[PDB]
Amino acid sequence: NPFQFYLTRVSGVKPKYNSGALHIKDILSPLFGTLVSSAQFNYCFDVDWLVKQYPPEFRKKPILLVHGDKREAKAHLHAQAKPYENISLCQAKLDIAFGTHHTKMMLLLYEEGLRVVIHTSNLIHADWHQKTQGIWLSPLYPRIADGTHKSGESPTHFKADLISYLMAYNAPSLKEWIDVIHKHDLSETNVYLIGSTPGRFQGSQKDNWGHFRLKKLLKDHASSMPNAESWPVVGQFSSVGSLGADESKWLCSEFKESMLTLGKESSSVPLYLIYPSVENVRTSLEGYPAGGSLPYSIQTAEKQNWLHSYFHKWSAETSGRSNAMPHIKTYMRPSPDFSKIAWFLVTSANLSKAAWGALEKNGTQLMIRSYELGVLFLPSAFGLDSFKVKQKFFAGSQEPMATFPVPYDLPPELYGSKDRPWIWNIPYVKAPDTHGNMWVPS
Ligand SMILES: O=C(O)c1c[nH]c2c(NCCS(=O)(=O)F)cccc2c1=O
């Protein structure tokens, strides 16, 4: 299949729904390459667990952990890694308040070449156990021969763009990986990189990151169609930031405006936001503990009740994952009848100004707090004008190269009048979950 978009394996669903899913043990398998060295970019790490996911024969190969922890949290991570002499750490600089290192990425250097994995899971058991998570697997990139001068660049500029993303860390351990990437041929890559890095971006640098990066790509490499105002926008996420006192402050002004962009010419566009309801969480495979990874706080939520009228339930019969709570984040542009999509993005970025960027300085500066990373699937990069939506995620479509595996159900279903968004720091004691328990936080 052209897209190489996968979900993680879910313990408890029928094998039909894990056939073609990937566990981390599969990604690190010798079948994928003979590992020489790896970098694991992430947010949360269980290092004992992580090393056990590598094949025994690869467990002493160098590992770089790229994280954002400071102070006591950083000390804890170093203490976790100290028993393993092959593990190095890179603390990503976070010089803007309330920023985090959320990017989930593996760089896998093999004897045979290089692989890049951009995904949505933390490196802890629970993130790969019963959650809906997304993975993009790069091709096996071969090495460029000694003395050969070629770019190794793709039509999507992915090689230079990934190097640019790494350069933003200004980190010596990552300069080594930049030099590795320089030595490999990434020309087969058919996705566009969409990253966020912390900073204040003006002028040309405005278009490098966050939602302005998405806007630039959609302007340059998608085409607008008639009735485009009728093509909805869908955002699907596991956490929500403080978006302001009403939709005009950020959500429908700059954010929706970037996501509505198509082509270079110049709103009624429906906006569907997908986020688990309390009932979604309660009846999930994990029960209420799934809400431990859906960190929407009551303090934030009570300031923006206007937002919840956009909320749609999690439903994923197409991939057998309605009870596997989402930690994947996705954004896409379906047709009015949801049979086609103009593009699809899988990313670590939740629905937050910190992740996507917020305009400052009279619209001249995009301020981003966090590191985020995703990949964008555009029909033009596959020789197509649109993608047909795959009807069943794990089935055999009549044209796999034209048919994109959307992992949850369309059309999204609006919350009912009795539904509420999952808010993780208030109690739920009216009905027990699938393990017989209530939710009593703090
Ligand atoms: O990007 C990610 O993978 C994630 C980032 N942060 C998370 C938090 N954040 C701390 C509470 S917070 O109120 O300070 F946001 C709690 C639970 C899960 C995640 C998570 O899964």
Q: Whose CA is nearest to atom 19 of ligand 1?
A: 293
Resolution to 1 decimal place, in Å: 1.8
Total number of domains constituting the chain: 2
Domain boundary among 157, 190, 223: 190
Distance CA(7)–CA(22), nearest Å, equals 6
Give the domain extent around 35. Answer: 1-190
Residue with tokens 């403080």: 242
Residue 67 shares a structural domain with residue 176: yes
Residue 83 shares a structural domain with residue 204: no
Cβ burial of 180 (10 Å; 0-12, 13-18, 19+) is middle
Distance CA(232)–CA(290), nearest Å, equals 29
Q: Are 34 and 55 in contact (CB under 8 A)?
A: no
The question of whether 102 is a catalytic residue gets the answer: yes
397 Cα–ligand 1 center, Å: 36
* E strands present in 213-361: 233-236, 271-274, 311-312, 329-334, 340-347, 358-360
Residue 62 shares a structural domain with residue 196: no
What are 153's two structure tokens? 């660049």
Domain boundary among 146, 161, 190: 190
Residue 230 shares a structural domain with residue 103: no
Pocket of ligand 1 (CB under 6 A): 43, 102, 122, 293, 295, 297, 348
Say which residues have a Cβ less than 8 Å from residue 57's Cβ, sequence separation at least 6: 30
Counting from 1 in the atom list of ligand 1, the atom nearest the Cα of 121 is 3
What CATH number does the domain containing 126 carry? Answer: 3.30.870.10
Q: Whose CA is nearest to atom 17 of ligand 1?
A: 293
Annotated binding site for substrate: 104, 329
Residue 227 shares a structural domain with residue 171: no
Q: Is the peptide bond before 411 cis (omega within 30 degrees of 0)?
A: yes
Print burial letters for 46-60: b (CB count within 10 Å at least 16), e (below 16): bbeebbebbeeebee
Q: Are 227 and 240 in contact (CB under 8 A)?
A: no
Helix axis angle, 158-167 to 172-182, nearest 10°: 170
Q: Whose CA is nearest to atom 18 of ligand 1?
A: 293
Residue 217 shares a structural domain with residue 331: yes
Counting from 1 in the atom list of ligand 1, the atom nearest the Cα of 327 is 21
Residue 148 shares a structural domain with residue 246: no
State the catalytic residue, choosing from 102, 119, 221, 312. Answer: 102
Print burial letters for 117-128: b (CB count within 10 Å at least 16), e (below 16): bbbbbbbbebbb
121 Cα–ligand 1 center, Å: 11
Residue 184 shares a structural domain with residue 140: yes
Residue 93 shares a structural domain with residue 208: no
Q: Whose CA is nearest to atom 10 of ligand 1?
A: 295
Residue 79 shares a structural domain with residue 104: yes
Domain boundary among 129, 159, 190: 190
Experimental method: X-ray
102 Cα–ligand 1 center, Å: 9
Residue 261 shares a structural domain with residue 307: yes
